[PDB]
Design a protein around this nucleic acid. Structure first.
Ligand SMILES: [Mg+2]
Ligand SMILES: [Mg+2]
Ligand SMILES: [Mg+2]
Ligand SMILES: [Zn+2]
Lengths: 148, 121, 49, 50, 181, 134, 18, 240, 13, 97
RNA sequence: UUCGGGUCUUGUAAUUGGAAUGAGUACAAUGUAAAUACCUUAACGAGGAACAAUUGGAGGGCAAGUCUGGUGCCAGCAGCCG
């Protein structure tokens, strides 16, 4: 049986009409380190970028990703466990974070992907209507969000 | 226990009769039990207002059954003479419905009552 | 400009009807069936991997 | 008028001399609004040729 | 000389205008609400950005500071009065949750369409620009007029308008005269 | 120790050091000495006046060829001969020798285009909304 | 694009002799 | 369209127990467990089979969300012949009877409903259908009717409540077999109207994951219904 | 398809 | 079994064979109707059925008994409008041929 | 990327009706040191509503048409010119 996934009802051509304030944002693992590297607090940094409340989210894979790093990145793990950071459960065997984040956005067009990875950034870019956040220079930047 | 159930209190009836009057002016109001029967069939109703003093009462007890089947909030108001006056018609009204229109100027007020009516149930 | 945008938007609505299904007020009148037909072997649901 | 425009075209091809526009019969206008507004088109059109 | 009269721009060009998502969003907004051109969307985006930045800056301040209380109370009052912010919704955090759309519905053109005086946003705009609509006792010909909650329910056809009671327009009486002749 | 003073009372040296090192930048040097416009194609101007010397590609058999649209022009300011592009062969027509032409920045090596001839825009003549005065 | 609309005029086929 | 006199060609659907009636215009149809009557006035198709008069009922997608789900092209429907089915929120026989048709005589359908008045017809319709079990009880307390239900191979929930996720889990923990099927119909407005529809859908998927239900499929129900989806999941008791 | 292929011949050239 | 449809008899009737052919070529029957692109191969198991309308739908969706006829081909025969369109189309096809 | 695939009231180079209105013209009044203009308003003022919106960008197609080159009918360039 052939399967052609439906176009999400939340997308008006290349415009995602479903994402609105307050935002739900998936944190990729590398995001935390660069945020620490640039002395940018997570929760306020997102607020300054989007001028609206952001509800950061961390999946099991990203959480598992951080623990495996070791003592050097203890601070990143502590920030990731900030109670304002909600958690997402995963139902796939692999711990590979990049694939997990790509899948979730494909299923629900409600998440901003917060990452710096060139490979992941390109993959999310192909998926329509996925705002893509990153930390560069002095503060966070969001590329595909019309409301800004 | 009583066949008319739930029965809105005075505060709730006042707010309901406020909305129905506004819906009348904006042509979002269907009046009469037969109309309320039809709108449920087409699935274009937000909630059904009914008169608990209707003479006899049962004659509108088919509307609750259709509503509960279709998951439409419904409520009873004490007075039919009051309900008819709010609707703007010169005769008593036993049943009324609010037509569905997300592009109506009174959407917020309708949903406000639609919240409270649900709590009453 | 207002006329030009009006035509552009309604044209876009027609195209959006092609790319995906859209709620169109639901059933009107007696249920006649599926005017455009049913495909037995095609699935549109998004799969969880 | 024609003869006004033609002479300018003759001048433009055979060497532009100094050209000064002189408007006449302005008293015939009955309203100041149309008088001032009419002056504007005549000047700007004159600014196209000269 | 005479003292200067201050002025300011009411709109700003977005950061990178050519985003496909942004183009489609402007298309949807203009089509739904009958906006003439993109400058209206830019204007309202500028206003909303100013408001939401002010709300963020006040939120940064601690609770109970005099400036936070005073400015936040004023901003909530203005947003509630204009109708974008609902009565049960009186906090600065919810001001951060506003969108351009709300201000778009608060436009007089949209209100005229919704109230049933006009069946379509373009018909509503045409009525506004032809002096057929009055807010209370005042004739308003500005589609961008922002309607307050109290003013919302006084919108009506103007007494001078042919639809509001006056004599028929030039076309109707001309046709009647020619038919009589 | 980053190779620089950090004392609370060393403001003087940091300033003197900064001023000396600021002259290293070519951009800073050009801005202060006003030599940034030597590199500009027109010597700081936005447009260049010239005389039309010859139409090099007038003969070229191939219509709308890149050669056809080239005209040799001598800049009045300095007298150096250069080439200019004309928008099209039809626009090559309005140009004739010994006409004044205003030039603007644009076959390699041709970096100029004709924007006015005899004090009127070539596009105006091309759209034919005006007539060249002689 | 400096081509006039007249330059792109349609050229019609000569009809065959009767 | 499908006027009373029209003939039709019926062929089997991909899903067992579901059939397609062709013609000028196509219809989803299920075999009538009780021939000679329509539960909610739906059209009924009769075929001459050696001769006994076998009868078939038209399934209306605008009325039943499951049929609308089949139409969108759901990959897997655990509802199948000879399969025990627990239908939550059985408002009436509008959808239950069709589900009873699919499972057939061997299968059974456990209908759970709360409000007494809609239930009364559920008992009335249940009398016609031996394979339906009308349980007039609140689904929020599965223990009250734990007597009437053994495990059910699939759980179908059309309950339109904000806490439907909790309702599903309690029933699933008690009655759904391991690797059992779960098919949920979600209405965004009832759960949380403040936020967009799709964010609600993602939220429910997360709650199902917390309850050891692995989601398999998701599908929105347009153009038949606005702001709705059906999510299909499998219940892994040991661990997600 | 022919129009696309002729158009593609331009991108190739 | 309860869910098993009958075998079509080998050497099936002309009326059945024609009926399967229309619904395969159902697209061409009405100019104002269009359908999904769909490759149909004749089913392994099928049956021919009679639709029974609800009596409340007597005015809305009930065919006259005289109009009721056994085979789909001949119900399309009675519809004058379908005949009129087809007559014009084939003539247009014939002249081109 | 070919292979093809997805979708349904879409298109017309077709006809046709009476309602609204200001750019403009203009009794008057208001405005002003006196005027113009605005806000008002008797009376006129629309179907190509010719009461004739612009500035740039991208891409076609055509000939008993014209130039160049060559492992035949092609290719390049281009075509206000037959
Ligand atoms: Mg004027
Ligand atoms: Mg007037
Ligand atoms: Mg050191
Ligand atoms: Zn994961």
């Amino acid at each position: 049986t052939r399967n052609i996934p439906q176009v999400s009802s939340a997308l008006f051509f290349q415009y995602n009409q479903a994402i609105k304030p307050p935002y739900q944002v998936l944190i990729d693992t590398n995001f935390i380190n660069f945020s620490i590297q640039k002395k940018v607090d997570i929760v306020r940094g997102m607020m300054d970028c989007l001028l609206a409340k952001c509800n950061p989210l961390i999946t099991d894979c990203v959480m598992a990703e951080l623990e495996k790093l070791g003592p050097k990145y203890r601070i990143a793990l502590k920030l990731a466990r900030d109670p304002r950071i909600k958690r997402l459960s995963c139902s796939h065997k692999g711990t590979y974070a990049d694939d997990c984040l790509v899948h979730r956005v494909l299923q629900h067009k409600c998440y901003i992907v917060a990452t710096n990875d060139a490979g992941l950034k390109q993959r999310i870019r192909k998926i329509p209507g996925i705002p893509l956040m990153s930390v560069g220079g002095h503060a966070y930047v969001i590329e595909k969000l019309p409301d800004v | 226990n009583p066949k008319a159930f739930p029965l809105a209190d005075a505060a709730l009836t006042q707010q309901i009769l406020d909305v129905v009057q506004q819906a009348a002016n904006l042509r979002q109001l269907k009046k009469g039990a037969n109309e309320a029967t039809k709108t449920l069939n087409r699935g274009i109703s937000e909630f059904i207002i009914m008169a608990a003093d209707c003479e006899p009462i049962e004659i509108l007890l088919h509307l609750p059954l259709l509503c509960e089947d279709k998951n439409v909030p419904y409520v009873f108001v004490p007075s039919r003479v009051a309900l008819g006056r709010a609707c703007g018609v010169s005769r008593p009204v036993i049943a009324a419905s609010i037509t569905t229109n997300d592009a109506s100027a009174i959407k917020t007020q309708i949903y406000a009552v639609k919240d409270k009516i649900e709590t009453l149930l | 400009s207002r006329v030009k945008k009006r035509k552009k938007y309604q044209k876009a609505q027609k195209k959006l009807k092609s790319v995906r299904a859209v709620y169109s007020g639901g059933q009107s009148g007696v249920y006649e069936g599926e005017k455009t037909g049913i495909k037995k072997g095609l699935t549109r649901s998004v799969k969880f991997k | 008028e024609m003869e006004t425009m033609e002479f300018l075209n003759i001048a433009q091809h055979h060497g532009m001399p100094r050209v000064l526009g002189v408007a006449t019969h302005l008293d015939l206008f009955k309203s100041q609004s149309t008088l001032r507004a009419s002056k504007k088109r005549l000047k700007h059109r004159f600014w196209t040729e000269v | 000389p005479r003292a200067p009269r201050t002025y300011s721009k009411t709109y700003s060009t977005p950061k990178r205008p050519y985003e496909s998502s942004r183009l489609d969003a402007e298309l949807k907004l203009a089509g739904e609400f009958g906006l003439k051109n993109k400058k209206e969307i830019y204007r309202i985006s500028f206003q909303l950005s100013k408001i939401r930045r002010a709300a963020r800056d006040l939120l940064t301040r601690d609770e109970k500071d005099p400036k936070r209380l005073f400015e936040g109370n004023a901003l909530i009052r203005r947003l509630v009065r204009v109708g974008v912010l609902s009565e049960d919704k009186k906090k600065l955090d919810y001001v951060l949750a506003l969108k351009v759309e709300d201000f778009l519905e608060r436009r007089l053109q949209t209100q005229v369409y919704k109230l049933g005086l006009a069946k379509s946003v373009h018909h509503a705009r045409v009525l506004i620009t032809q002096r057929h609509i009055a807010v209370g006792k005042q004739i308003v010909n500005i589609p961008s007029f922002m309607v307050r909650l109290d003013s919302e329910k006084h919108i009506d056809f103007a007494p001078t308008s042919p639809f509001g009671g006056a004599r028929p327009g030039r076309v109707a009486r001309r046709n009647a005269a020619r038919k009589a002749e | 120790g980053k190779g620089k003073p950090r004392g609370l009372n060393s403001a003087r040296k940091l300033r003197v050091h900064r001023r000396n090192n600021r002259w290293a930048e070519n951009n800073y040097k050009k801005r202060l000495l006003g030599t940034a416009f030597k590199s500009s194609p027109f010597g700081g101007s936005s447009h260049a006046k010239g005389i039309v010397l010859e139409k090099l590609g007038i003969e070229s058999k191939q219509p709308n060829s890149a050669i056809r649209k080239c005209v040799r022009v001598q800049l009045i300011k300095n007298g150096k001969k250069v080439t200019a592009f004309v928008p099209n062969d039809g626009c090559l027509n309005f140009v004739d020798e010994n006409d004044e032409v205003l030039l603007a920045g644009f076959i390699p090596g041709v970096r100029f285009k004709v924007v006015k001839v005899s004090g009127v825009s070539l596009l105006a003549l091309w759209k034919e909304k005006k007539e060249k005065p002689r | 694009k400096l081509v006039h609309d007249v330059q792109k005029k349609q050229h019609r086929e000569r009809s065959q002799l009767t | 369209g499908a006027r009373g006199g029209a003939k039709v060609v019926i062929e089997p659907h991909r899903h067992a127990g579901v059939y397609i009636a062709r013609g000028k215009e196509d219809l989803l149809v299920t075999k009538n467990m009780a021939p000679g009557e329509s539960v909610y006035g739906e059209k009924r198709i009769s075929v001459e089979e050696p001769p006994t008069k076998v009868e078939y009922r038209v399934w209306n997608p605008f009325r039943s969300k499951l049929a609308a789900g089949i139409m969108g092209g759901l990959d897997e429907l655990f509802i199948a012949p000879g399969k025990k089915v627990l239908y939550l929120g059985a408002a009436s026989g509008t959808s239950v009877s069709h589900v009873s048709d699919v499972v057939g005589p061997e299968g059974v359908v456990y209908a759970v409903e709360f409000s007494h008045r809609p239930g009364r017809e559920l008992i009335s319709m249940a009398k016609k259908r031996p394979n339906i079990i009308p349980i007039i009880e609140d689904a929020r307390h599965p223990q009250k009717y734990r007597m009437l239900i053994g495990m059910v191979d699939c759980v179908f929930a059309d309950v339109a409540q904000p806490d439907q996720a909790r309702i599903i889990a309690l029933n699933s923990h008690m009655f759904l077999k391991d690797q059992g099927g779960v098919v949920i119909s979600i209405k965004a407005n009832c759960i949380d109207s403040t936020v967009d529809a799709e964010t609600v859908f993602a939220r429910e998927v997360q709650k199902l994951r917390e309850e050891r239900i692995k989601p398999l499929e998701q599908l929105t129900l347009e153009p038949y219904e606005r702001d709705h989806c059906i999510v299909v999941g499998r219940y892994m008791r040991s661990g997600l | 398809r022919k129009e696309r292929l002729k158009k593609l011949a331009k991108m190739e050239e | 079994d309860w869910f098993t449809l009958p075998k079509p008899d080998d050497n099936m009737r002309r009326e059945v064979q024609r009926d399967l052919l229309l619904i395969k070529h159902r697209a061409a029957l009405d100019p104002k109707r269009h359908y999904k692109k769909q490759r149909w191969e004749v089913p392994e198991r099928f049956a021919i059925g009679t639709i029974i309308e609800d009596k409340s739908e007597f005015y809305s969706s009930r065919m006259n008994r005289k109009e009721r006829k056994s085979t789909i081909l001949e119900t399309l025969m009675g519809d004058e409008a379908s005949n009129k369109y087809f007559k014009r189309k084939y003539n247009e096809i014939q002249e081109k041929s």
